[PDB]
Structure 1
Amino acid sequence: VVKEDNIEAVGKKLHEYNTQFQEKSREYDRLYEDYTRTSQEIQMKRTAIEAFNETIKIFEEQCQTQERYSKEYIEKFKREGNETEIQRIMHNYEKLKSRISEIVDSRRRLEEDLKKQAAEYREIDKRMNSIKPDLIQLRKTRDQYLMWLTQKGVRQKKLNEWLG
């Protein structure tokens, strides 16, 4: 595993691999912050959609009610001489329907957010799964060098200098 002959050369490489390890280990930790924050944000969006769904459900309960109640009301009071409040009742209901589109559209905008974020989340997870094998090998290489030098009796002072 060690590709060098003399202490000083081996020690110089130990420094490179440890510096490479620490830089990579930092890149992973940086991506892990992004990754987890994104899960949190996704979970938030996912419940916000549930809140939209459940709000739209409540709006559709109104629509059912006005339809039924309007019909029943009109029949009890005949629609005969009194027809002034029908155009009102119907115009109010146009506003009700019109508000539901706005809300339906917002849910649609959030869903498109969630979709863009979900694809970023997967790209973060792809990036870290390609880092992982490098991080592991650099750790294992670093240790092999520390071993090699320790077996040869190289002093801790020189090793500490090479690990800085």
Structure 2
Amino acid sequence: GSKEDSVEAVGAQLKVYHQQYQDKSREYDQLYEEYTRTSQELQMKRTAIEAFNETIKIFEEQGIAEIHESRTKLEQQLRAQASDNREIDKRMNSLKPDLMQLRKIRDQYLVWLTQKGARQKKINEWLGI
């Protein structure tokens, strides 16, 4: 209980850094999976708005009226979804430095323990295998 105490305490820090990296990694994948979900729906809402107002221009030269409100509702939901989709892009943009720095310092703690005598079985226990 002296120099090994420092090894055990640092090895405990390796656990916390590993959890935090995996906890923010799990958070980052939820944001990306939901981000591509909304942008695909933004696409569909977009060309649906096209075919909406294109059913107007294609038959306004001849002259079917209450359809304008459906297009106004879609354009309302479009920029409301694009707003929330922008917030998702902002949330996970501030995570990349967190993920990179957590991963780098996790590796540096792993290497520090290796140089101090911690074998591979000790490293896996702190890493949850």
Aligned with 1:122 (options 70, 75, 86): 86
**Distance across 2 between alignment mates of 1:153 and 1:50:** 66
Aligned with 1:135 (options 75, 99, 113): 99
**Amino acid of the residue matched to residue 160 of structure 1?**
N
For CA contacts below 8 A with separation 6 or more, give which structure has more relative contact order: 1
Using the TM superposition, name which of 149-158 and 121-130 deviates more. 149-158
Aligned twin of 1:85? none
**Distance across 2 between alignment mates of 1:153 and 1:51:** 68
Aligned twin of 2:111? 147
**Amino acid of the residue matched to residue 53 of structure 2?**
N
Aligned twin of 1:60? 60
**Amino acid of the residue matched to residue 25 of structure 1?**
S
**1:8 Cα deviation after fit:** 0.8
Aligned twin of 1:91? none
Aligned with 1:107 (options 53, 57, 71): 71
Identity level (%): 73
**Distance across 2 between alignment mates of 1:153 and 1:57:** 76
**Distance across 2 between alignment mates of 1:53 and 1:151:** 68
Aligned twin of 1:50? 50
- Which has more radius of gyration? 1
**Amino acid of the residue matched to residue 46 of structure 2?**
R
Deviation digits for residues 96-117 of structure 1 (CA, Å, limit 9, x no counterpart): xxx32x1111111100010100
- What is the SS of the residue equivalent to 2:37? helix
Aligned twin of 1:6? 6
RMSD over aligned Cα, in angstroms?
1.1
**Distance across 1 between alignment mates of 2:96 and 2:53:** 39
**1:62 Cα deviation after fit:** 2.0
- What is the SS of the residue equivalent to 1:6? helix
**Distance across 2 between alignment mates of 1:17 and 1:38:** 32
TM-score w.r.t. length of structure 2: 0.92
Q: Which runs of 5+ in 1 are unaligned?
A: 64-98
Q: Which runs of 5+ in 2 are unaligned?
A: none
**Distance across 1 between alignment mates of 2:52 and 2:61:** 14
Query: Is residue 31 of structure 2 the alignment partner of residue 31 of structure 1?
Result: yes
**1:53 Cα deviation after fit:** 1.7
**Distance across 2 between alignment mates of 1:117 and 1:109:** 12
TM-score w.r.t. length of structure 1: 0.73
